[PDB]
C-alpha cells in the first residue's frame, strides 16, 4: 500500500517491487530495482527517506525519522534484514544491516560494511566502510575481509533477482 | 481492525487514530487522541490491554499478556516506539519507550521515564519515574534533565499532531 | 494469506490457524493444531521451511532462510514468541524461544529448551537440550529444573486451546 500524507506521496520506480503488507506513506523515493518485503512500513511523515537503487528493505522493517534530525538516506544494493528499525540515519552503498538491529538517527554507515544481527548503532554514531561492527552499544570489530567484501558485491543482486521471480508471479502457473 | 475475542469488543474512542495493518483483538481500550501505527498489534485476549488518552504505540509493535499475571497499562501520553514488545507490564504517564525494546510480565516503569532503544526490561523489574534506564538487561543510567522532561511533556502531543495530520 | 511461489503452495494443515496479517509464502509445511499469529511472515522461497504440530510462531515474527544453508525445521509443541526472527536453524520439540529473539543459520536449539527474551544464537550454535541459553551472543546459563520442563510441556498446550477459542 502507498499512502499519502499532506502533499506527498511516494515516488516508486516502475522496477521496484513491493510485497504484500507493506505500508509506504508520504515522502518516499524508491529507486530502480529496489525490492521491499513482506509486512515492512516505510514512513515519510516528519522527514524524507530515499532509497537507491537495488536495495532491499526485509520483512517486518521498519523506516522511520524524526522532525528536524537527518532524513532516512539509503544507498544503492543496500541488504536491510528482516525487521531492522532504520530511523533517521544514512547508510552507504552495498552495505547489509544484519536482521533485528537499530539504527538511530543522525548514525551513517559506510559503504561496503556489515552490521551484525541484532546490533544497537546509537544516535550520531558513525561507522567506517569496509568493516565488520556489531553488539549493543555496536562497536567496530575488525575490517571486512576480500571474501564478505565479494559478498556483499552480491547479495543485494541476488534479492533483485529473486523479486524478478515475484514480479512475473501471473507469468507462472 | 478490531476483532472480539470471546466476550469481548474492543473499546476505542471516537477520537483514536488507528493506521493500517493494525490488529486489535479482545479486551483492549484505547483512549482519546491515542495513536496506532502501522502493523501494530495490540492482542487482548488472555488478559486485558488498557492505553490512556493520547498514547502513541509504533508501528510494527506488539502489545500481549499472560494468564493469571499482570494486565498491560499504559497511562496517558506515553510514547512506545516501533517494533517494541510490550508484555503484562505498567508503564506509567509521559514515559518513552525506545524503539525495539522488549518489557517483560510485571515489570513497571514510572511516569516521565526514557527507556532507551533496544532495552530489555526483564520481569518484575521496577524503573522508578524521572530516570533514564537502557540496555539488555536495563539498568537506570541517571535522572532526566529537565530538558529531557520536557521532551517528555511533548514528544506524545507531537505524536498527536502528526496523527491528525493523516485526517483520518 | 497462503502465497504461492514458482511452483510452491504452501501446505498447510486443515487444523492449522492462521491469524490476520500473516504471510505464508512457497515451500512452507505447517503441522496439525500449530498456530500462526498476526503479522507474521514466513517466507518459504530461497530454502524451505517446515513447522510441525502444535507449534505457536507468535505476531509480527519473522521465519525465513538461505540459499544453500540449512532449512528452518521447528519441531512439535514449540513456541516462538513475538517478534521472533528465526532464520534457517533447527528447534527440537517443546522448546522455548522468547520474545524478540534472532536465531541465525545453521543453529540447533535442542529440545525442552528455553531460549531468554531478546536473546542472539549465532549461526551454526549447537544449543544443547533441556537448558536455558540467553544474551546476546546467547551462553547456555544452566539446565533446566522439572518446573520449567512441566512449564514447556503445557505452554504450547495452551496456545493451541487459545487459538481453538478465536
Ligand atoms: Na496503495
Ligand atoms: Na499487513
Ligand atoms: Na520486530
Ligand atoms: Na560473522
Ligand atoms: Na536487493
Ligand atoms: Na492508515
Ligand atoms: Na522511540
Ligand atoms: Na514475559
Ligand atoms: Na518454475
Ligand atoms: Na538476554
Ligand atoms: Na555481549
Ligand atoms: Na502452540
Ligand atoms: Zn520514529
Ligand atoms: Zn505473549
Ligand atoms: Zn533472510
Known amino acids: 500500500m502507498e499512502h499519502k500524507y499532506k502533499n506527498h506521496l511516494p515516488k516508486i520506480h516502475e522496477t521496484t517491487f513491493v510485497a504484500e503488507g507493506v505500508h509506504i506513506i508520504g515522502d518516499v523515493e524508491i529507486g530502480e530495482d529496489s525490492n521491499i518485503w ?22 517486518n522493517a521498519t523506516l522511520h525519522a524524526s522532525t528536524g534530525q537527518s532524513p532516512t538516506i539509503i544507498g544503492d ?23 533485528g538491529s537499530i539504527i538511530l538517527d543522525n548514525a551513517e554507515i559506510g559503504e ?9 548503532v546509537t544516535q550520531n554514531k558513525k561507522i567506517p566502510p569496509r568493516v565488520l561492527c556489531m553488539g549493543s552499544p555496536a562497536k567496530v570489530i575488525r575490517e571486512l575481509t576480500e571474501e564478505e567484501i ?5 547479495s543485494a543482486k541476488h534479492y533483485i533477482e529473486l523479486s524478478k521471480n515475484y514480479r512475473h508471479h501471473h507469468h507462472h502457473h
Open 112 to 120: 561496503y560494511t556489515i552490521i551484525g544481527a541484532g546490533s544497537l
Open 38 to 59: 513482506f509486512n515492512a512500513v516505510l514512513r515519510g511523515d516528519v522527514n524524507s527517506i530515499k532509497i537507491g537503487r537495488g536495495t532491499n528493505i526485509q520483512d
Open 77 to 99: 544494493y543496500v541488504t536491510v534484514g528482516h525487521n531492522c528499525i532504520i530511523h533517521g540515519c544514512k547508510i552507504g552503498d552495498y552495505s547489509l544491516i544484519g536482521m
Open 150 to 154: 565479494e559478498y556483499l558485491k552480491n
